[PDB]
Design an enzyme around this catalytic site. Structure first.
Site, PDB file in Angstrom:
ATOM      1  N   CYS A  11       0.805  -1.239   0.000  1.00 23.39           N
ATOM      2  CA  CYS A  11       0.000   0.000   0.000  1.00 23.39           C
ATOM      3  C   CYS A  11       0.821   1.263   0.000  1.00 23.39           C
ATOM      4  O   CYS A  11       1.544   1.572   0.965  1.00 23.39           O
ATOM      5  CB  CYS A  11      -1.015   0.027   1.152  1.00 23.39           C
ATOM      6  SG  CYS A  11      -2.001   1.517   1.192  1.00 23.39           S
ATOM      7  N   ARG A  65      -0.045   4.561   2.741  1.00 23.16           N
ATOM      8  CA  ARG A  65       0.158   4.380   4.183  1.00 23.16           C
ATOM      9  C   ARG A  65       0.536   5.597   5.021  1.00 23.16           C
ATOM     10  O   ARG A  65       0.417   5.529   6.217  1.00 23.16           O
ATOM     11  CB  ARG A  65       1.102   3.220   4.474  1.00 23.16           C
ATOM     12  CG  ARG A  65       0.494   1.867   4.182  1.00 23.16           C
ATOM     13  CD  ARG A  65       1.494   0.760   4.492  1.00 23.16           C
ATOM     14  NE  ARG A  65       2.533   0.650   3.481  1.00 23.16           N
ATOM     15  CZ  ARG A  65       3.651  -0.042   3.631  1.00 23.16           C
ATOM     16  NH1 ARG A  65       3.894  -0.687   4.767  1.00 23.16           N
ATOM     17  NH2 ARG A  65       4.522  -0.100   2.634  1.00 23.16           N
ATOM     18  N   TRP A 113      -9.259   6.661  -0.590  1.00 19.49           N
ATOM     19  CA  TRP A 113      -9.536   7.349  -1.850  1.00 19.49           C
ATOM     20  C   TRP A 113      -8.574   6.870  -2.951  1.00 19.49           C
ATOM     21  O   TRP A 113      -7.538   6.257  -2.672  1.00 19.49           O
ATOM     22  CB  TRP A 113      -9.432   8.863  -1.704  1.00 19.49           C
ATOM     23  CG  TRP A 113      -8.159   9.344  -1.091  1.00 19.49           C
ATOM     24  CD1 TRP A 113      -6.939   9.539  -1.724  1.00 19.49           C
ATOM     25  CD2 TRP A 113      -7.957   9.701   0.276  1.00 19.49           C
ATOM     26  NE1 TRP A 113      -6.009  10.001  -0.813  1.00 19.49           N
ATOM     27  CE2 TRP A 113      -6.608  10.103   0.415  1.00 19.49           C
ATOM     28  CE3 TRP A 113      -8.789   9.736   1.401  1.00 19.49           C
ATOM     29  CZ2 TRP A 113      -6.078  10.539   1.643  1.00 19.49           C
ATOM     30  CZ3 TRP A 113      -8.258  10.160   2.614  1.00 19.49           C
ATOM     31  CH2 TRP A 113      -6.918  10.566   2.716  1.00 19.49           C
ATOM     32  N   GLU A 155      -5.095   4.030 -10.689  1.00 20.88           N
ATOM     33  CA  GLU A 155      -5.901   2.835 -10.478  1.00 20.88           C
ATOM     34  C   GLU A 155      -7.050   2.804 -11.492  1.00 20.88           C
ATOM     35  O   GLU A 155      -7.347   1.758 -12.061  1.00 20.88           O
ATOM     36  CB  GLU A 155      -6.444   2.768  -9.057  1.00 20.88           C
ATOM     37  CG  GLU A 155      -5.359   2.795  -7.976  1.00 20.88           C
ATOM     38  CD  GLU A 155      -5.973   2.782  -6.584  1.00 20.88           C
ATOM     39  OE1 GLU A 155      -6.511   1.732  -6.221  1.00 20.88           O
ATOM     40  OE2 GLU A 155      -5.919   3.789  -5.852  1.00 20.88           O
TER      41      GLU A 155
HETATM   42  C1  HEM Z   1      -6.135   6.602   1.840  1.00 21.25           C
HETATM   43  C2  HEM Z   1      -5.977   6.425   0.522  1.00 21.25           C
HETATM   44  C3  HEM Z   1      -5.287   5.166  -0.038  1.00 21.25           C
HETATM   45  C4  HEM Z   1      -4.606   5.125  -1.190  1.00 21.25           C
HETATM   46  C5  HEM Z   1      -4.328   6.264  -2.216  1.00 21.25           C
HETATM   47  C6  HEM Z   1      -4.140   3.781  -1.336  1.00 21.25           C
HETATM   48  C7  HEM Z   1      -3.430   3.339  -2.401  1.00 21.25           C
HETATM   49  C8  HEM Z   1      -3.295   2.016  -2.698  1.00 21.25           C
HETATM   50  C9  HEM Z   1      -2.990   1.468  -4.010  1.00 21.25           C
HETATM   51  C10 HEM Z   1      -2.794   2.290  -5.315  1.00 21.25           C
HETATM   52  C11 HEM Z   1      -2.875   0.149  -3.856  1.00 21.25           C
HETATM   53  C12 HEM Z   1      -2.566  -0.897  -4.965  1.00 21.25           C
HETATM   54  C13 HEM Z   1      -3.950  -1.247  -5.498  1.00 21.25           C
HETATM   55  C14 HEM Z   1      -3.977  -2.097  -6.732  1.00 21.25           C
HETATM   56  O1  HEM Z   1      -3.064  -1.985  -7.605  1.00 21.25           O
HETATM   57  O2  HEM Z   1      -4.974  -2.874  -6.819  1.00 21.25           O
HETATM   58  C15 HEM Z   1      -3.125  -0.165  -2.452  1.00 21.25           C
HETATM   59  C16 HEM Z   1      -3.069  -1.423  -1.907  1.00 21.25           C
HETATM   60  C17 HEM Z   1      -3.477  -1.777  -0.644  1.00 21.25           C
HETATM   61  N1  HEM Z   1      -3.986  -0.947   0.353  1.00 21.25           N
HETATM   62 FE1  HEM Z   1      -4.141   1.076   0.090  1.00 21.25          FE
HETATM   63  N2  HEM Z   1      -4.493   3.011  -0.238  1.00 21.25           N
HETATM   64  C18 HEM Z   1      -5.269   3.820   0.566  1.00 21.25           C
HETATM   65  C19 HEM Z   1      -5.885   3.426   1.750  1.00 21.25           C
HETATM   66  C20 HEM Z   1      -5.947   2.166   2.316  1.00 21.25           C
HETATM   67  C21 HEM Z   1      -6.720   1.758   3.475  1.00 21.25           C
HETATM   68  C22 HEM Z   1      -7.697   2.667   4.271  1.00 21.25           C
HETATM   69  C23 HEM Z   1      -6.420   0.475   3.720  1.00 21.25           C
HETATM   70  C24 HEM Z   1      -6.943  -0.446   4.840  1.00 21.25           C
HETATM   71  C25 HEM Z   1      -7.328   0.129   6.002  1.00 21.25           C
HETATM   72  C26 HEM Z   1      -5.477   0.045   2.716  1.00 21.25           C
HETATM   73  C27 HEM Z   1      -4.892  -1.189   2.603  1.00 21.25           C
HETATM   74  C28 HEM Z   1      -4.336  -1.686   1.451  1.00 21.25           C
HETATM   75  C29 HEM Z   1      -3.949  -3.063   1.257  1.00 21.25           C
HETATM   76  C30 HEM Z   1      -4.116  -4.244   2.235  1.00 21.25           C
HETATM   77  C31 HEM Z   1      -3.394  -3.129  -0.150  1.00 21.25           C
HETATM   78  C32 HEM Z   1      -2.789  -4.323  -0.924  1.00 21.25           C
HETATM   79  C33 HEM Z   1      -3.618  -5.564  -1.155  1.00 21.25           C
HETATM   80  C34 HEM Z   1      -2.631  -6.718  -1.331  1.00 21.25           C
HETATM   81  O3  HEM Z   1      -1.858  -7.107  -0.384  1.00 21.25           O
HETATM   82  O4  HEM Z   1      -2.624  -7.264  -2.454  1.00 21.25           O
HETATM   83  N3  HEM Z   1      -5.187   1.099   1.913  1.00 21.25           N
HETATM   84  N4  HEM Z   1      -3.324   1.014  -1.742  1.00 21.25           N
HETATM   85  C1  LIG Z   2      -5.715 -11.311  -5.666  1.00 26.46           C
HETATM   86  C2  LIG Z   2      -5.966 -10.009  -6.375  1.00 26.46           C
HETATM   87  C3  LIG Z   2      -6.174 -10.011  -7.752  1.00 26.46           C
HETATM   88  C4  LIG Z   2      -6.411  -8.800  -8.398  1.00 26.46           C
HETATM   89  N1  LIG Z   2      -6.614  -8.780  -9.736  1.00 26.46           N
HETATM   90  N2  LIG Z   2      -6.431  -7.642  -7.689  1.00 26.46           N
HETATM   91  C5  LIG Z   2      -6.239  -7.613  -6.341  1.00 26.46           C
HETATM   92  C6  LIG Z   2      -6.266  -6.273  -5.619  1.00 26.46           C
HETATM   93  C7  LIG Z   2      -7.318  -6.145  -4.501  1.00 26.46           C
HETATM   94  C8  LIG Z   2      -7.050  -4.809  -3.829  1.00 26.46           C
HETATM   95  C9  LIG Z   2      -6.560  -4.733  -2.520  1.00 26.46           C
HETATM   96  C10 LIG Z   2      -6.304  -3.479  -1.933  1.00 26.46           C
HETATM   97  C11 LIG Z   2      -6.528  -2.314  -2.680  1.00 26.46           C
HETATM   98  C12 LIG Z   2      -7.029  -2.445  -3.978  1.00 26.46           C
HETATM   99  C13 LIG Z   2      -7.292  -1.240  -4.839  1.00 26.46           C
HETATM  100  C14 LIG Z   2      -8.507  -0.503  -4.368  1.00 26.46           C
HETATM  101  C15 LIG Z   2      -8.179   0.595  -3.353  1.00 26.46           C
HETATM  102  C16 LIG Z   2      -8.579   0.447  -2.018  1.00 26.46           C
HETATM  103  C17 LIG Z   2      -8.321   1.442  -1.082  1.00 26.46           C
HETATM  104  C18 LIG Z   2      -8.750   1.188   0.343  1.00 26.46           C
HETATM  105  C19 LIG Z   2      -7.676   2.610  -1.504  1.00 26.46           C
HETATM  106  C20 LIG Z   2      -7.299   2.725  -2.862  1.00 26.46           C
HETATM  107  N3  LIG Z   2      -6.690   3.811  -3.358  1.00 26.46           N
HETATM  108  N4  LIG Z   2      -7.535   1.735  -3.736  1.00 26.46           N
HETATM  109  N5  LIG Z   2      -7.271  -3.668  -4.519  1.00 26.46           N
HETATM  110  C21 LIG Z   2      -5.992  -8.808  -5.662  1.00 26.46           C
END
Ligand code: HEM
Ligand SMILES: Cc1cc(N)nc(CCc2cccc(CCc3cc(C)cc(N)n3)n2)c1
Ligand code: HEM
Ligand SMILES: Cc1cc(N)nc(CCc2cccc(CCc3cc(C)cc(N)n3)n2)c1
Ligand SMILES: C[C@H](O)[C@H](O)[C@H]1CNc2nc(N)[nH]c(=O)c2N1
Ligand SMILES: C[C@H](O)[C@H](O)[C@H]1CNc2nc(N)[nH]c(=O)c2N1
Ligand SMILES: [Zn+2]
Lengths: 411, 407
Positions: A108, A111, A280, A285
Site C-alpha cells: 500500500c 500508508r 480514496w 488505479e
Molecule cells: C487513503 C488512501 C489510499 C490510497 C491512495 C491507497 C493506495 C493504494 C494502491 C494504489 C494500492 C494498490 C492497489 C492495486 O493496484 O490494486 C493499495 C493497496 C493496498 N492498500 Fe491502500 N491506499 C489507501 C488506503 C488504504 C486503506 C484505508 C487500507 C486499509 C485500512 C489500505 C490497505 C491496502 C492493502 C491491504 C493493499 C494491498 C492488497 C494486497 O496485499 O494485495 N489502503 N493502496
Molecule cells: C488477488 C488479487 C487479484 C487482483 N486482480 N487484484 C487484487 C487487488 C485487490 C485490492 C486490494 C487493496 C486495494 C485495492 C485497490 C482498491 C483501493 C482500495 C483502497 C482502500 C484505496 C485505494 N486507493 N484503492 N485492490 C488482488
C-alpha cells in the site's frame, strides 16, 4: 542484525531493524524469489502466543508494557482462550489492530494516512440485513459528499470457520460485467463471474456498461443475501478531459469510493473475514488499470483513434500517449467535482516521506516494490529508485479464497 | 518443487522446473524478500567444471558418452595439475550464450542464441585489448545494423593478474563537477572521468565527450586509449512533430556495450568480457535523459511544450516523458540505427519466456528489471508472474577496479 536500503537517486541509505519482528513468511527462499507472484481455524495452542505478541505490541504502544493492566489483560485473555477456545478484543485493541494491519500493508502506497482511519465496530452484527445497514453507513460516512475519509467496518470474527461473516463482493462498489454470446463483454470484464452469481441469486441486471453491483452478504455462515446500495449513496464522477471536448462522449464515468471488501484482517490470531475498508483513489488505479488493461475496459484504441495518433507502429508510442491523456482526464474530473483523488507523483513522494519517517520512528517500513511502483511513468516517481524490504508483520490484511468456492450452501 | 506462474491478463499458466537446477543464491529468505535490492580452490573448481560439462554435453545430445567422460577426465587432470583449466572454443561459445540466456534481468534474451563470440584469450597487453575492443565495436555497430557481440579476455588466475575494462560501458559520456556547483555532461560518470583526468586524459569539458577506454591487462596498471571517433556511431535527437527539440542539443550513442561485469563459466571467471546489443528506447529516453541524477531534462522539455508545471496532477512530467521517448525512437529509426521500443521488446520477451518454458522448463526473470520504466501495465510483462533464480553460466557484478587495484 541490520539491513540497509539505498535510494539510487539520492544516495540516502536507511537501516532496517524492524524486519527482526517479522513472523509470517514471504514465499521466497535463498534459491528462489517469488517477489512478483500475485498470491504467494486456530488451536488454543497456536492462539496463546499470537494473542500474547499482539498484547505486548499494544501495551508497548500505549507505554504500559509490563504494567498491572498489561498483566491482567494477558491473564484475562489466556483464561478466555482456555475456557472458550477464542477471545474478544477490547475496542481500543481492535482500533489499534486495524490501524496496524494498514500500517503493515507492504503493498500500500497510501500508508502515510494509516493513523487516520475511522474504525466501525460491527461485532454486534448478526444478520445480512444488519451487515447491509453497517455498510451503507460506512459508505455514506466515507464518501462525505466527495471529501473522502478512510474507514473500515469490522464484522464478527471467525469461530469454527462454519459461521463466517463474508462480503462476497470484491469491492463495496463495482460495475457489473456481462459476457455476450458473441464473446464480447459489456461493462467490466473483471466482474463477470461475480455478476453471474448475483444474477443467479435473483438480481435483475440492467445490462448497461456501468451498473453498480448489488451487495451479496453472508452473515454467520448463512447463505448470502442480495441488497442494492441506495443509488444516492453511490457517488460517481463523469469523465471529461480539460482540453479534449470529445472525451466526455466516450461515456466514461467511475465511482469515487474505493472500498476493498474481500480481504481478511488478522489481529492477535483472530480472523475478521469481513472487514471492508476504504480510502480514496490514486488516479492511475482508474486511468491505467481500470480503463486501459486489456482485460478491463480496454479503451486505449478508441482514445488513440479519436486523438488520431499514428497507430500503425507501436514505436509511435500511441498507447503511451493515449494513456497519459486518459489519466489527465481522470484527475481533472475528480478534482473538478471535488472528489478526493491523489496523482501518482504526489502519492509516491508522500510514501517516500512516510517510509523515511517509519525507518526513523519504527526501525523499518516493509514495502513491496512490485506493487508500490505506479503502472505508468515508473522511473519518474521517487519510489522506482528506492530499494525496499518486503516482510510480513501482524496485524495484517490477507487474501482469502472467493466464498463461492468454499461456501457450504444451506438451501 | 514444481512452480506455477500465471499471466493475469491472459490467464495462461506455465510450470517451472528449471529452478531446481538453480545454483547461486537470491539474497531472499523465507522472512524477507530482497527482490528490489540492486546488488544483494581446486576442490571448489571441479564440481563447478563437472556441472558445466554435464550441461554442455547434454546440450549436444552426448551426455554420458565416451567424449563426455574423456573431457571430464581431461579437465580434472588439468585442474589437479595446474589448479585451473581452459575451455574449448565450443565450450566458450556455449558458456557465453548461456550466461545471456540466464540473465534474469535482461528483456532482450529472445536473441540469446545469436551472439557473436570473440575469443580474446590470447590477448596479453592493454594495447591488444584496445585492438580487440575497436574490432568488437566496429563489428557490433555494422553501420547501424547492430549485431550482438561479446569479447572475452583471459580468465582470472591468482586474482593478481586480472584483465579489466575500467569503464562501465565501452561507450559513455564524461561527467564533470563545475565551480558552478552543477554537473556538466553525465553525472553518473564523474568519478570515472576524474580517474581518466588523473591518468592523463585531456578532457574537452563538453556535455557529450566520449570517455577514453581505461584498460588493464594481466593485472598491470590500466592504460588510456581513445576509441577512433569514426567507430563511435552517435544519433542526434529530434522529434517528428516538435521542430524546437533538436535545439536542446541532445544526442546519444548507438551501441550499448556493458564492460564491467564478470562472466562465470564452469567456475572460471572472465573479469573482462565486454558485451553489446542494441538499445530499448526507454533506456535512453526514460533513464539516461530523465533520471534526476542523470541528464535530468524533464523540466527543460516541459517548458518548451508550454505545459502547466504548477501542479503534479496536470501530468506534465508524464507528457514530456512520452515525447522525449518518441523523439529517441524517431531519431534512431530515421538514422537507421537498430532500436527496439518497450512494447515490441516486452512482447518478444513474453514469446521468449513461453519458448523457454516449453523447451527448457523455465526462464528466470526479475520482474523489477524486466518491466519498462514507463507505461509498465500497458506492456504484457507487467501482468506476468516471473520466478527469479540464479543459473550458471552467468554475468555477475564485481567491485569497481579502482577500489580493488593495487597501483
Ligand atoms: C487513503 C488512501 C489510499 C490510497 C491512495 C491507497 C493506495 C493504494 C494502491 C494504489 C494500492 C494498490 C492497489 C492495486 O493496484 O490494486 C493499495 C493497496 C493496498 N492498500 Fe491502500 N491506499 C489507501 C488506503 C488504504 C486503506 C484505508 C487500507 C486499509 C485500512 C489500505 C490497505 C491496502 C492493502 C491491504 C493493499 C494491498 C492488497 C494486497 O496485499 O494485495 N489502503 N493502496
Ligand atoms: C488477488 C488479487 C487479484 C487482483 N486482480 N487484484 C487484487 C487487488 C485487490 C485490492 C486490494 C487493496 C486495494 C485495492 C485497490 C482498491 C483501493 C482500495 C483502497 C482502500 C484505496 C485505494 N486507493 N484503492 N485492490 C488482488
Ligand atoms: C540485443 C538487444 C538487447 C536488449 C534489447 C537488451 C535489453 C536489456 C535491458 C533493457 C536491460 C536493463 C538494463 C538497465 O535498465 O540498465 C538489460 C539488462 C541486461 N542484459 Fe540485456 N539486452 C540486449 C542484449 C544483451 C546481450 C547481448 C547481453 C549479454 C551477452 C545482455 C545481458 C544483460 C545482463 C547481464 C543484464 C542485467 C545486468 C544485471 O544483472 O543487472 N543483454 N538488457
Ligand atoms: C554497477 C551498476 C549500477 C547500476 N545502477 N546499474 C548497472 C547496470 C549495468 C547494465 C548491465 C546490463 C545492461 C545495461 C544496460 C545497457 C544495455 C546493454 C546491452 C548489452 C543491451 C542493452 N539494450 N542495454 N546496464 C550497473
Ligand atoms: C530500487 C530498484 O531495485 C532500482 O531502482 C531498479 C528498479 N528497476 C530497474 N530496472 C531496470 N531495467 N534498470 C534499473 O536500473 C532498475 N533500477
Ligand atoms: C505479475 C505481477 O506481480 C502482477 O501483475 C502485479 C504487478 N504489480 C501490481 N501493482 C499493483 N499496484 N497492482 C497490481 O494489480 C499489480 N499486479
Ligand atoms: Zn524475494
Amino acid at each position: 542484525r541490520f539491513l540497509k536500503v539505498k535510494n539510487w537517486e539520492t544516495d540516502v541509505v536507511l537501516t532496517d531493524t524492524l524486519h527482526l519482528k517479522s513472523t509470517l513468511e514471504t514465499g521466497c527462499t535463498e534459491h528462489i524469489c517469488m517477489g512478483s507472484i500475485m498470491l504467494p481455524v486456530r488451536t488454543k495452542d497456536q492462539l496463546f502466543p499470537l494473542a500474547k505478541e499482539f498484547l505486548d505490541q499494544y501495551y508497548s504502544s500505549i507505554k504500559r508494557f509490563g504494567s498491572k493492566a498489561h498483566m491482567d489483560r494477558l491473564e484475562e485473555v489466556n483464561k478466555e482462550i482456555e475456557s472458550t477456545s477464542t477471545y474478544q478484543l477490547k475496542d481500543t485493541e481492535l482500533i489499534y489492530g486495524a490501524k496496524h494491519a494498514w500500517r503493515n500493508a507492504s503493498r500500500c502506497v497510501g500508508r502515510i494516512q494509516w493513523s487516520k482511519l475511522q474504525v466501525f465496530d460491527a461485532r454486534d452484527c448478526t444478520t445480512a440485513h444488519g451487515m447491509f445497514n453497517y455498510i451503507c453507513n460506512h459508505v455514506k460516512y466515507a464518501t462525505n459528499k466527495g471529501n473522502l475519509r478512510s474507514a473500515i467496518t469490522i464484522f464478527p470474527q471467525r469461530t469454527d470457520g462454519k459461521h463466517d461473516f463474508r462480503v462476497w463482493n470484491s469491492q463495496l462498489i463495482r460495475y457489473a460485467g456481462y459476457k455476450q454470446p458473441d464473446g464480447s463483454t459489456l461493462g467490466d470484464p473483471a466482474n463477470v463471474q461475480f455478476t453471474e452469481i448475483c444474477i443467479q441469486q435473483g438480481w435483475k441486471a440492467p445490462r448497461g456498461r456501468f451498473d453498480v453491483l448489488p451487495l451479496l452478504l453472508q452473515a454467520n455462515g448463512n447463505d448470502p443475501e442480495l441488497f442494492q446500495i441506495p443509488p444516492e449513496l453511490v457517488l460517481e464522477v463523469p469523465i471529461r478531459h480539460p482540453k479534449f471536448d470529445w472525451f466526455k462522449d466516450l461515456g466514461l464515468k467511475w465511482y469515487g469510493l474505493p472500498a476493498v471488501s474481500n480481504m481478511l484482517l488478522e489481529i492477535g490470531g483472530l480472523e475478521f473475514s469481513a472487514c471492508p475498508f476504504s480510502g480514496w483513489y490514486m488516479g492511475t488505479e482508474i486511468g491505467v488499470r481500470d480503463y486501459c488493461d486489456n482485460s478491463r475496459y480496454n479503451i486505449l484504441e478508441e482514445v488513440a483513434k479519436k486523438m488520431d495518433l499514428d497507430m500503425r507502429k507501436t514505436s509511435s508510442l500511441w498507447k503511451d500517449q493515449a494513456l497519459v491523456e486518459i489519466n489527465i482526464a481522470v484527475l481533472y474530473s475528480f478534482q473538478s467535482d471535488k472528489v478526493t483523488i491523489v496523482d501518482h507523483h504526489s502519492a509516491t513522494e508522500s510514501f517516500i516521506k512516510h517510509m523515511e519517517n517509519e525507518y526513523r520512528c519504527r526501525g523499518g517500513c516493509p514495502a513491496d516494490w512490485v506493487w508500490i511502483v505506479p503502472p505508468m511513468s515508473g522511473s519518474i516517481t521517487p519510489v522506482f529508485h528506492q530499494e525496499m524490504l518486503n516482510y510480513r508483520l501482524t496485524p495484517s490484511f490477507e487474501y482469502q479464497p472467493d466464498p463461492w468456492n468454499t461456501h457450504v450452501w444451506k438451501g
